[PDB]
Amino acid sequence: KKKPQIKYEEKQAVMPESAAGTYTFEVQTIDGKLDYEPYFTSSTLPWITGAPTISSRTDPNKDVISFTCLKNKTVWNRRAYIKFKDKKTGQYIKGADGKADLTVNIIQKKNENPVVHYKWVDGIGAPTENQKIKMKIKNNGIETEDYFTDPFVFKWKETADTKFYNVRKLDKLYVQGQFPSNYFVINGIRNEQIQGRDISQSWAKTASNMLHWWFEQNKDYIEQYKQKAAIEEWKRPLYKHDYIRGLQDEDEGKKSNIANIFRAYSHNNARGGYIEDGLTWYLYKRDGQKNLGSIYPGLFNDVFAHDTSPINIERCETKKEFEQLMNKTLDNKRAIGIFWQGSKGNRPYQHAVTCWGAAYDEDNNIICLYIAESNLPEAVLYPFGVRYKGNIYEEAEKNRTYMFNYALSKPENIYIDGLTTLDKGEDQWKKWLEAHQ
């Protein structure tokens, strides 16, 4: 007698809808009914209940295989794989080429109607519906007539009433021949005239946004500092954060005193800089930052010298590391700088941006970030989708947090290497105020 065989066209994926249910596919049975058992290749499939089974063999030509999925609440497809063990021989059954194991690809489809929730950096409010701007899908750099339909895909428009900060690079907004010839002129601290450029200053724009937030959150402590501290004469003008909303692009140099301090006085580096360096430079004295600029603000050195720094730097290489870091930062009322890393084209990529909040699916996966991107033109926060390298259910030792770039309508090999965070420093401020009673 001939030995029975099974066949399956492996190019056909099995794609259950997002709803929970017991789904099925068919396996062709040749020359009888082979005694086999189906198995998932992973034992860490929390979204599948049990093993696959042969639920019908009544048709001589095919078996029905059943498997049970939980609802896919996430906005991502998720993958599982079924192989087949010959129960008489104990070997995995071969596929069409006689060498590879017969493998059926399962892809449960994404949730088309997710319920999303949001966490914003403390103290910046939250977008109103009128402040959320939907985005057109681009193709070959041209906007199509289609829009991104996921509910978290919106720009957060800056208005007179919004409370985030997004200082933009003058060197990116500038249009030669159309902007004012004095566009880059800064009136320095001794009323001296300075042409400050900022093409490589994403670290300093990110620091400036975070510092604007910090001056605002701590404004009552800073008022007490101005009243009670022995302020060095030359630094007195710097105890001030002005961020003037509603300006035209051609007036960006008149928008932010903090960003202008970096643009006038910070020394240049084409290899960029570090968010944490600019933050330290503005707030307290460290020898490492002695050569950052031609001045050293160090405006609250006697609050933070010899105490906890409110600045931290952490890295993340897995989904778990990224979400714990984001949640810890958001839940502890801190501001967020992101240092992106990867490739933009056939060239290395590094860039600092500011994060003002995150979107979450019903499983509390982080699915989108709201980014102040000093390279991008609009006076808005841009959504950057979150994508993770491989299986999020069976995480590998490295599963970086890649960015989907809705403004360019494309994934990019750009991932989040880590966060630089800025804490209010409430305990340090309290100890300073208690010592100045």
| Chain contacts with Na ion (rule: CB under 5 A) | 45, 48
Shortest CB 55 distance to Na ion, Å: 17
Q: Kindly state the smallest distance separating residue 112's Cβ from Na ion, in Å.
A: 24
How far apart, in whole angstroms, are the C-alpha atoms of residue 103 and residue 105?
A: 6
Q: Is 227 in a helix, a strand, or coil?
A: helix
| Residue 323: partners with Cβ closer than 8 Å, 6 or more residues away | 364, 365, 366
Which amino acid, one-letter code, is at 181?
S
241 half-sphere exposure, CB direction, 13 A CA radius: 20
Minimum distance from residue 347 beta carbon to Na ion (Å):
11
CB of 81 to Na ion, least distance (A): 13
Minimum distance of Na ion from residue 373's CB (angstroms): 10
> CA 157, 162, 168 angle in degrees (round to 5)?
60
Residue 106 CB burial class (10 angstroms; 0-12, 13-18, ≥19)? buried
Q: Which is nearer to Na ion, 105 or 159 (CB)?
A: 105
Nearest to Na ion of 7, 172 (CB atom): 172
Nearer to Na ion, 48 or 338 (CB): 48
Look at residues 54, 63, 59 and name the one whose alpha carbon lies nearest to residue 26: 63
> Least CB distance from residue 321 to Na ion, whole Å?
24
Task: Select 10 or 171, whichever has its Cβ closest to Na ion.
Answer: 171
Q: Judged by CB, which is closer to Na ion: 45, or 124? A: 45
Concatenating the DSSP letter of every residue in 345-390 gives SSSEEEEEEEEEEEEE-TT--EEEEEEE-TTS-SSEEEEEEEEESS
Residues 6+ apart with CB under 8 A from 68: 21, 22, 23, 48, 49, 50
42 vs 332 by CB, closer to Na ion: 42
Residue 204: CB minimum distance to Na ion, A: 12
Distance CA 93, CA 87 (A): 10
**From the CB of 46, what's the least distance to Na ion, in Å?**
6
Contact status, residue 160 vs residue 246, Cβ threshold 8 Å: yes
Task: Name every residue whose Cβ is closer than 8 Å to that of residue 290 and which is 6 or more positions away in sequence.
Answer: 296
Q: Which is nearer to Na ion, 150 or 412 (CB)?
A: 412
> Is 200 or 312 the residue whose CB approaches Na ion more closely?
200
